[PDB]
GROMACS .gro file of N, CA and C in nm:
model
   81
    1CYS      N    1  -3.610  -7.122  10.046
    1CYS     CA    2  -3.615  -7.043   9.960
    1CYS      C    3  -3.752  -6.940   9.943
    2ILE      N    4  -3.775  -6.808  10.004
    2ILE     CA    5  -3.871  -6.762  10.002
    2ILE      C    6  -3.846  -6.584  10.000
    3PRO      N    7  -3.955  -6.519   9.969
    3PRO     CA    8  -3.922  -6.389   9.912
    3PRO      C    9  -3.959  -6.335  10.061
    4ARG      N   10  -3.953  -6.175  10.065
    4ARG     CA   11  -3.965  -6.091  10.177
    4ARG      C   12  -4.088  -6.046  10.189
    5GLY      N   13  -4.117  -6.084  10.351
    5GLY     CA   14  -4.259  -6.094  10.392
    5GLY      C   15  -4.315  -6.238  10.402
    6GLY      N   16  -4.235  -6.327  10.442
    6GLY     CA   17  -4.297  -6.458  10.439
    6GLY      C   18  -4.229  -6.555  10.574
    7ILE      N   19  -4.229  -6.436  10.704
    7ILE     CA   20  -4.166  -6.508  10.817
    7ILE      C   21  -4.054  -6.598  10.838
    8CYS      N   22  -3.952  -6.587  10.907
    8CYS     CA   23  -3.817  -6.617  10.907
    8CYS      C   24  -3.735  -6.646  11.068
    9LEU      N   25  -3.791  -6.566  11.104
    9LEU     CA   26  -3.758  -6.548  11.285
    9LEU      C   27  -3.879  -6.579  11.388
   10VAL      N   28  -3.997  -6.576  11.318
   10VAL     CA   29  -4.095  -6.635  11.386
   10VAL      C   30  -4.130  -6.752  11.446
   11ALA      N   31  -4.131  -6.840  11.279
   11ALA     CA   32  -4.150  -7.001  11.295
   11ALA      C   33  -3.998  -7.040  11.227
   12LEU      N   34  -3.996  -6.975  11.073
   12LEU     CA   35  -3.864  -7.022  10.998
   12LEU      C   36  -3.712  -6.993  11.055
   13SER      N   37  -3.641  -7.040  11.006
   13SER     CA   38  -3.469  -6.979  11.026
   13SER      C   39  -3.390  -6.932  10.948
   14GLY      N   40  -3.452  -6.951  10.803
   14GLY     CA   41  -3.417  -6.901  10.676
   14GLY      C   42  -3.475  -6.896  10.543
   15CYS      N   43  -3.430  -6.806  10.463
   15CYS     CA   44  -3.524  -6.768  10.342
   15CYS      C   45  -3.431  -6.794  10.218
   16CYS      N   46  -3.481  -6.724  10.095
   16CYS     CA   47  -3.374  -6.748  10.007
   16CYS      C   48  -3.286  -6.634  10.007
   17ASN      N   49  -3.327  -6.534   9.976
   17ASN     CA   50  -3.180  -6.416   9.992
   17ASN      C   51  -3.220  -6.263  10.056
   18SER      N   52  -3.141  -6.219  10.107
   18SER     CA   53  -3.104  -6.111  10.210
   18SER      C   54  -3.231  -6.137  10.296
   19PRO      N   55  -3.259  -6.209  10.353
   19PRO     CA   56  -3.322  -6.253  10.481
   19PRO      C   57  -3.295  -6.213  10.627
   20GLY      N   58  -3.330  -6.091  10.665
   20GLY     CA   59  -3.297  -6.071  10.807
   20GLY      C   60  -3.399  -6.145  10.906
   21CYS      N   61  -3.508  -6.209  10.875
   21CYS     CA   62  -3.577  -6.240  10.975
   21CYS      C   63  -3.659  -6.153  11.093
   22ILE      N   64  -3.751  -6.157  11.090
   22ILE     CA   65  -3.801  -6.042  11.224
   22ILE      C   66  -3.957  -6.137  11.238
   23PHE      N   67  -4.025  -6.065  11.343
   23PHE     CA   68  -4.113  -6.139  11.385
   23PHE      C   69  -4.277  -6.141  11.332
   24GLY      N   70  -4.298  -6.208  11.212
   24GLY     CA   71  -4.414  -6.211  11.128
   24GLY      C   72  -4.380  -6.197  10.988
   25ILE      N   73  -4.272  -6.196  10.982
   25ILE     CA   74  -4.226  -6.144  10.816
   25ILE      C   75  -4.059  -6.214  10.795
   26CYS      N   76  -4.042  -6.252  10.691
   26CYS     CA   77  -3.901  -6.243  10.662
   26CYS      C   78  -3.866  -6.122  10.571
   27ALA      N   79  -3.770  -6.083  10.641
   27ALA     CA   80  -3.662  -5.951  10.619
   27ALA      C   81  -3.814  -5.834  10.614
   0.00000   0.00000   0.00000
């Protein structure tokens, strides 16, 4: 669980809510 702009596709796989996950930021 993390907010928007906290990496989710570059290192992580998922966040807290509405996370598109891009390169270098979660959503």
